[PDB]
């Protein structure tokens, strides 16, 4: 199956547990069953800082009591390749999307743009995406910029997902990951912690109200769904 294996999932050496709240959603909304998050990365390279960033994000999410799933786009058809939504990878990507209650997208910024593999993934998400939350992240080999995360945010908005305000943008990514692929203790890691903390809190909050949040006035008008006793006549 096209899922990435999270090695040492409980090993969080860059996290200061004296400050990390184990259960961020406690008091906001029920945490059972665990909040479901699908994580997507935008690099095919063996040593992808996008994936490794996504993996650190996953470890943090699991620590916060969330259930995670990291999609492996290795064989997902790329944008210019033979498209067919009957493709096994496309089908599994859709399945994971319907599964998730919230999502994390992480893309490298290649010259002010997100990557083909990131686009391909987004293009193959089911407006079935309505009401799911989203956290955006980017990595770059150069100076910190926000073009990729801003692009991701607007794509998420177009799909009617709720993109949280906090986001991650790692500058000179190569300097932040050791040989083992783990992330070094830094403000950047602290930021991913914050983003995942916020995403758990917000997802737990919005997840039980998906129906109601997507029950729109214009949709009721178009369908002729006259509100339960909104008139002075006996319904219906």
Please give the residues from 1 up to 40 whose contact with a second copy meets the rule CB under 8 A: 16-22, 24, 26-30
> Would you put residue 193 in left (φ > 0), alpha (ψ -120 to 50) or beta?
alpha
C-beta closer to a second copy: residue 22 or 178: 22
**Rounded to an integer, what distance in angstroms lies between the CA atom of residue 61 and that of residue 37?**
8
For the chain, how long is the longest CA-to-CA vector? 72
The CB-of-31 to Ca ion minimum distance in angstroms stands at 16
Binding window for Cl ion (CB under 5 A); candidates: 70-78, 102-110, 123-131, 148-156: 148-156
The CB-of-114 to a second copy minimum distance in angstroms stands at 7
Integer angstrom CA distances of residue 161 from 90, 116, 203: 20, 21, 11
Residue 10 lies near Ca ion (rule: CB under 5 A):
yes
Question: String of b and e for 78-88 (b: at least 16 CB within 10 Å)?
Answer: beeeeeeeebe
The CB-of-89 to a second copy minimum distance in angstroms stands at 11
Residue from 10, 179, 180, 218 touching a second copy (CB under 8 A): that is: 218
Residue 44 lies near a second copy (rule: CB under 8 A):
yes
Query: Residue 33 binds which one of Cl ion, a second copy, Ca ion, none, with CB within 5 to 8 A depending on kind?
Result: none
DSSP run (H or E) holding 163: strand 162-163
Nearest to 57 by CA among 154, 150, 136, 114: 136
Site for a second copy in 167-196 (CB under 8 A): 167, 171, 187, 190-191, 193-194
How many helical (H) and strand (E) elements, i.e. helices and strands, does the chain have? Answer: 7, 6
Query: Residue 10 binds which one of Cl ion, a second copy, Ca ion, none, with CB within 5 to 8 A depending on kind?
Result: Ca ion
Site for Cl ion in 190-219 (CB under 5 A): 191
* DSSP assignment of 110-160: BTTB--HHHHHHHHT---TTTT-EEEEEEE-SSS---HHHHHHHHHHHHTT
Kindly report the backbone phi and psi dihedral angles of residue 72, in degrees, each rounded to the nearest multiple of 5, phi listed first: -105, 105
The CB-of-40 to Ca ion minimum distance in angstroms stands at 22
**Rounded to an integer, what distance in angstroms lies between the CA atom of residue 98 and that of residue 92?**
10
C-beta closer to Cl ion: residue 36 or 153: 153
Kindly report the backbone phi and psi dihedral angles of residue 206, in degrees, each rounded to the nearest multiple of 5, phi listed first: -85, -30
Binding window for Ca ion (CB under 5 A); candidates: 1-9, 27-35, 75-83, 110-118: 1-9
The CB-of-6 to a second copy minimum distance in angstroms stands at 20
Residue 163 lies near Cl ion (rule: CB under 5 A):
yes
Residue 22 lies near Ca ion (rule: CB under 5 A):
no
List interacting residues with Cl ion (CB under 5 A).
153, 163, 168-169, 191
List interacting residues with Ca ion (CB under 5 A).
9-10
């Amino acid at each position: 199956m096209r899922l990435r294996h999270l090695s040492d999932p409980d090993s969080l050496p860059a996290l200061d547990k004296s400050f990390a709240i184990e259960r961020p959603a406690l008091g906001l909304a029920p945490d059972a069953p665990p909040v479901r998050i699908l994580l997507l990365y935008g690099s095919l390279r063996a040593r992808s800082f996008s994936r490794l960033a996504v993996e650190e994000a996953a470890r943090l999410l699991q620590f916060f009591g969330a259930e995670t799933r990291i999609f492996d786009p290795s064989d997902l058809p790329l944008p210019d390749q033979v498209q067919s939504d009957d493709h096994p990878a496309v089908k599994e990507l859709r399945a994971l999307s319907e599964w998730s209650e919230g999502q994390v997208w992480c893309s490298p910024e290649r010259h002010g743009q997100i990557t083909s593999v990131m686009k391909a993934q987004i293009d193959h998400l089911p407006r079935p995406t309505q009401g799911r939350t989203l956290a955006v992240m980017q990595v770059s080999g150069g100076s910190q910029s926000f073009n990729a995360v801003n692009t991701l945010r607007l794509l998420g908005r177009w799909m009617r997902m709720f993109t949280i305000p906090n986001q991650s943008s790692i500058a000179k990514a190569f300097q932040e990951f050791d040989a083992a692929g783990r992330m070094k203790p830094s403000p950047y890691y602290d930021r991913i912690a914050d983003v995942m903390e916020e995403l758990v809190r917000f997802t737990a909050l919005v997840r039980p109200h998906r129906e109601a949040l997507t029950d729109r006035y214009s949709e009721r008008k178009a369908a002729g769904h006259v509100i339960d006793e909104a008139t002075d006549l006996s319904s219906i």
